[PDB]
Design a protein around this nucleic acid. Structure first.
Ligand SMILES: [Mg+2]
Ligand SMILES: [Mg+2]
Ligand SMILES: [Mg+2]
Ligand SMILES: [Zn+2]
Lengths: 86, 177, 148, 115, 156, 81, 30
RNA sequence: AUCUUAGUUCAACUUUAAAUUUGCCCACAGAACCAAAUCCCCUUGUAAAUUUAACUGUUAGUCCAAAGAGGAACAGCUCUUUGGACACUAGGAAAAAACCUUGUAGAGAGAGUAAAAAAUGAUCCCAAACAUAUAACUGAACUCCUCACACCCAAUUGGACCAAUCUA
RNA sequence: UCUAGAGUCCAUAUCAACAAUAGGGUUUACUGGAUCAGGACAUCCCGAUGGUGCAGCCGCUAUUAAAGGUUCGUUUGUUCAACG
RNA sequence: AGAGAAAUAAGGCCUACUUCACAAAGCGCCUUCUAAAUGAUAUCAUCUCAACUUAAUACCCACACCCACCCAAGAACAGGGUU
């Protein structure tokens, strides 16, 4: 039990976390063709996929918010110049 | 190793007689080692219900050494059952009275508190002095190391290791030493 | 409960997968009443599922008869002599197909507590442990505190 | 009585000694927080049970991502003692519409593609 | 620096200094070659492997059985190969992965001999004085894998 | 009796938690935006999500009923002949 | 001199003053 | 509130069905002259909240942290308030409702952790021991792992099944 | 525990005032006796020791000691008290 | 340091007295085992949480029966004797 050491070396604290043990296919057929993947692997792919989609969505929203703020600063700081003529 | 069935089974679960000296050893350390060996907690094949306990033979039990002032403070207590029969006796007294009892009580305390305890204590042999019966000498197999290293006094330091150590200070010469 | 139940050790019939796998179920008897209401799922199974099962398992002799007259049942016989009855009265065709496959997919041993989940006949390769492994030896084989 | 705690802002002021002690930087801060729960909501006031139920931190460790904007920090400053916050690191950039199903989050907090 | 010998100057453990790596690498290569030449000539007997499977680490050897508590969607008697070998050993040598052994170095074959449902298990909850009593019966399924061969190859 | 004797293991556990929360303090003294910059950037998503909740809540209604399901119940007397 | 809740006890123990070790021991050096 | 405090009715809380759209958290602004915090909302994280139809059930609980009033600032004392726990699971402090850790439930002969060890008067003392071999390890029904999932609260309320008998 | 006040001189041979530090209770107004007794010591006696202002047995205090012992009667019964 | 005498407590007995009478008893009888010396830390000194030296036996104790009778043994069972 070396969770401290494993996290000090960029590994999962729990050897049953992410690693060759948990996600490589536990078996193949005798001939060589691979096996229908295991349920746990499917569920972890789905959850990691959802995590990535959420990451990209939140980052996009924050960047778009920054751009919207830039636009508003432009159209309020410069449209006051239209009142500086005539 | 290709042994037949019955010989293999006998070889794996057999009992081994461990000697263990006790000269200038504290009762507790001998007790710890004896507890481990009697219980069977030195066998990779251990289990509680397999009766893998071994034999232990502690000699020189008269010569143990108690840390500190325990001789004058550690009080063993007993009660006969009859009124007024509550006897409290120090370690020095109980050592003179029965030179084996201190180590026996240590090992009795450490062992587990179940029915097996008595059986394990039937495999503890404690002999006060160097003498051991022949029928028990002819059974020993190993000789567990003493757990305390007997510090050695000036009487057994050779002049080599006495003059090897430096002389840390200078006396005056007028002084009478 | 465990204490209140028999037990056995993990085993196979005739070292089944060692040389060649053999299918233990060898006979399967269906009794299906032609009229009873409880024999409806059984009638569906015989009408549209038993031929395919017979084709997929040619080592099993499947008999079906129509003389319980009120209650169906399936009696599975195995190579090792064991018999095993199962009720199919008042069950669906899905349930009967699942059950019959389950019968054809197991060895006829008793369904009781398997004490060990791993059975090995050669558990040791380097020699099973005995108190003299990992223990030294001394000159002339002397016991401690000897003289000669 | 026992009351909500208003943490003075003085504590949330990274010093020149803190900055080189954790892998951060005053300028160019980090987009997303990865947050995990390392303590029970039980035995704590309801105004922390609700916050945790709102940040999606109901389950145990099970990391979850949130924006690094003050509207969420105000919530994390109430539950800062039942969570570990680390900054998500993207040393390969946001994934594309390809590589969404082949991502992975390492214990150091870096999101990467194809393990 | 110098300190005269006492009971605490040095600690009570020995100063174990490791061999110089330059020679140690040669020694390791030599012993690796020795083990390899043992493998090539068939200088071994029965083998055993530490195979990782459903979630468990089974210590197995040829002709033995294993019981997995989860159905494995395999017909009766379909040979399969068990990847994830953590350790494979013979009488004189044994190979340790970090943490797995390559797909080429070790080949473990198994077969599905029986699929069935375990013996009925009881789940009963009870609490005193609250009229709380409930009983459930569960039969988790399971399958018996026979292990047919542990073969090794001289790829070191 | 009533007083206790706080061990060393407990001190180390408490210091572990104190360090974790000090790191938490650090990772909260630098926000990506400010109060005013963020304002509104999530309005569209929030509105659409609540509209999804509304459309879910306002769709409750009994399920359909088919003649086939009713007439299938006559199968409970199907016989061979 | 009443007893403290246990968690207050741990807090008092962890926050206990630790003094700065002197560079040298005065006995064997001024 | 009650010829009422051994009970009832109303409210508050709970449950079901149904309709609709905002509910909670929340910065800045704002609330008097004579310390903790509280109230109120834009955003933000969320998915809940209000309304309608229809019933029962609970109600003046114990302990712990805190601020007060009464009895010392005590009598393990009566009472008010903010919070937690209990009356629900599990692991710890010796036994342990009330302290610390932990919740959503099944199988595993897998794994990582949480809390968690003492310092220097009256029957019969009460674990046994240990000064110095490198700090890590141990430790749950928490979490991960392979498979399966409706399958751990009282009063109450909703739902799915059903033993045996009679009749068509 | 400070002795500070005394004691024919002098705090320590005795009380030792207030206070402080300790162990222990205070319920009413606007349950004994016989029988058998188990136990603690904070000791009444017996035992051992220190000082004494006992110049000595005994006295006085102080330390230690729980193996043993710790009476019979008149009057009366919140259970005690008085008396031989 | 001894010697007598008495009581009590425990244990036991019945020769005498006493109540009684093949015996059981007491009111009777018997037995009971903290002051020194040397001396350092602190060279004198100092009794030393300095080293160091001084101030209970007795009792029980036979592997192998038991029908009958007797008994100072006894509730039954056990125990002693039957030459
Ligand atoms: Mg508002
Ligand atoms: Mg869970
Ligand atoms: Mg008489
Ligand atoms: Zn010095």
């Amino acid at each position: 039990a070396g969770g401290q050491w494993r996290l000090q070396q960029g590994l999962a604290a729990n050897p049953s976390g992410y690693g060759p043990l948990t996600e490589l296919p536990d078996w193949s057929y005798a001939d060589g063709r691979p096996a229908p993947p295991m349920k746990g692997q499917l569920r972890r792919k789905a959850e990691r996929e959802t995590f990535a989609r959420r990451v990209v969505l939140l980052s996009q929203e924050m960047d778009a918010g920054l751009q919207a703020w830039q636009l508003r600063q432009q159209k309020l700081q410069e449209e006051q110049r239209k009142q500086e003529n005539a | 190793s290709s042994f037949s069935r019955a010989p293999q089974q006998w070889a794996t679960f057999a009992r081994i007689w461990y000697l263990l000296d006790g000269k200038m050893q504290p009762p507790g350390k001998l007790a710890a080692m004896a507890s481990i060996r009697l219980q069977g907690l030195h066998k990779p094949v251990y289990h509680a219900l397999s009766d893998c306990g071994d034999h232990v033979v502690i000699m020189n039990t008269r010569h143990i050494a108690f840390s500190g002032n325990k001789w004058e403070q550690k009080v063993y207590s007993s009660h006969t059952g009859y009124p007024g029969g509550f006897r409290q006796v120090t370690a020095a007294q109980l050592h003179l009275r029965d030179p084996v009892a201190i180590v026996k009580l240590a090992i009795y305390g450490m062992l587990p508190k179940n029915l097996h305890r008595r059986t394990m204590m039937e495999r503890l042999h404690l002999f006060p002095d160097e003498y051991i019966p022949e029928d028990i000498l002819k059974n020993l197999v190993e000789e567990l190391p003493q757990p305390r290293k007997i510090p050695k006094r000036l009487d057994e330091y050779t002049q080599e290791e006495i003059d090897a150590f430096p002389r840390l200070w200078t006396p005056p010469e007028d002084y009478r030493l | 409960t465990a204490r209140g139940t028999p037990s056995r050790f993990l085993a196979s019939v005739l070292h089944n997968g060692l040389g060649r796998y053999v299918q233990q179920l060898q006979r399967l008897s269906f009794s299906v009443s032609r009229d009873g209401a409880s024999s409806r799922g059984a009638r569906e199974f015989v009408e549209r599922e038993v031929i395919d099962f017979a084709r997929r398992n040619p080592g099993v002799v499947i008999y079906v008869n129509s003389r319980p007259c009120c209650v169906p049942r399936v009696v599975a016989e195995y190579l090792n002599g064991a018999v095993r009855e199962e009720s199919i009265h008042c069950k669906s065709v899905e349930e009967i197909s699942t059950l019959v496959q389950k019968l054809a997919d197991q060895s006829g041993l008793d369904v009781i507590r398997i004490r060990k989940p791993f059975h090995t006949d050669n558990p040791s390769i380097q020699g099973q442990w005995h108190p003299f492994t990992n223990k030294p030896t001394t000159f002339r084989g002397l016991r401690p505190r000897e003289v000669q | 009585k026992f009351t909500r705690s208003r943490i003075p802002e003085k504590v949330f002021q990274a010093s020149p000694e803190d900055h080189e002690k954790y892998g951060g930087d005053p300028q160019n801060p980090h987009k997303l927080h990865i947050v995990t729960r390392i303590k029970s909501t039980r035995r704590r006031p309801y105004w922390e049970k609700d916050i945790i139920k709102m940040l999606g931190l109901e389950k145990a460790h099970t990391p979850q991502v949130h924006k690094n904007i003050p509207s969420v920090n105000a919530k994390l400053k109430v539950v800062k003692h039942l969570i570990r916050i680390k900054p998500l690191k993207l040393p390969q950039g946001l994934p594309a519409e390809e590589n969404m199903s082949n991502t992975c989050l390492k214990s150091t907090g870096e999101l990467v593609v194809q393990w | 620096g110098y300190v005269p010998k006492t009971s605490l100057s040095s600690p009570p453990w020995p100063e174990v200094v490791l061999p110089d790596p330059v020679e140690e690498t040669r020694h390791h290569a030599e012993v690796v070659k020795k083990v390899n030449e043992m493998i090539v000539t068939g200088q071994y007997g029965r083998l055993f492997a530490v195979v990782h499977f459903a979630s468990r680490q089974w210590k197995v050897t040829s002709e033995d059985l294993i019981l997995i508590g989860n159905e494995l969607d395999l017909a009766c008697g379909e040979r399969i190969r068990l990847e994830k070998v953590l350790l494979v050993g013979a009488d004189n040598f044994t190979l340790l992965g970090k943490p797995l052994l390559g797909k080429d170095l070790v080949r473990v074959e198994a077969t599905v001999i029986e699929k069935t449902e375990s013996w009925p298990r009881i789940i009963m909850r009870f609490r005193k004085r609250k009229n709380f009593k409930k009983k459930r019966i569960v039969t988790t399924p399971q399958t018996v894998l026979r292990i047919n061969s542990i073969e090794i190859a001289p790829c070191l | 009796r009533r007083p206790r004797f706080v061990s060393l293991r407990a001190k180390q556990n408490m210091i572990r938690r104190l360090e974790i929360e000090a790191e938490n303090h650090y990772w909260l003294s630098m926000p990506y935006m400010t109060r005013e910059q963020e304002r509104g950037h999530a309005a569209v998503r929030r509105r659409e999500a609540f509209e999804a909740i509304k459309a879910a809540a306002t769709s409750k209604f009994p399920p359909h009923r088919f003649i086939a399901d009713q007439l299938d119940h006559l199968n409970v007397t199907k016989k061979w002949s | 001199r009443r007893v403290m809740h246990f968690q207050r006890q741990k807090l008092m123990a962890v926050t206990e003053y630790i003094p700065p070790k002197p560079a040298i021991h005065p006995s064997c050096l001024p």
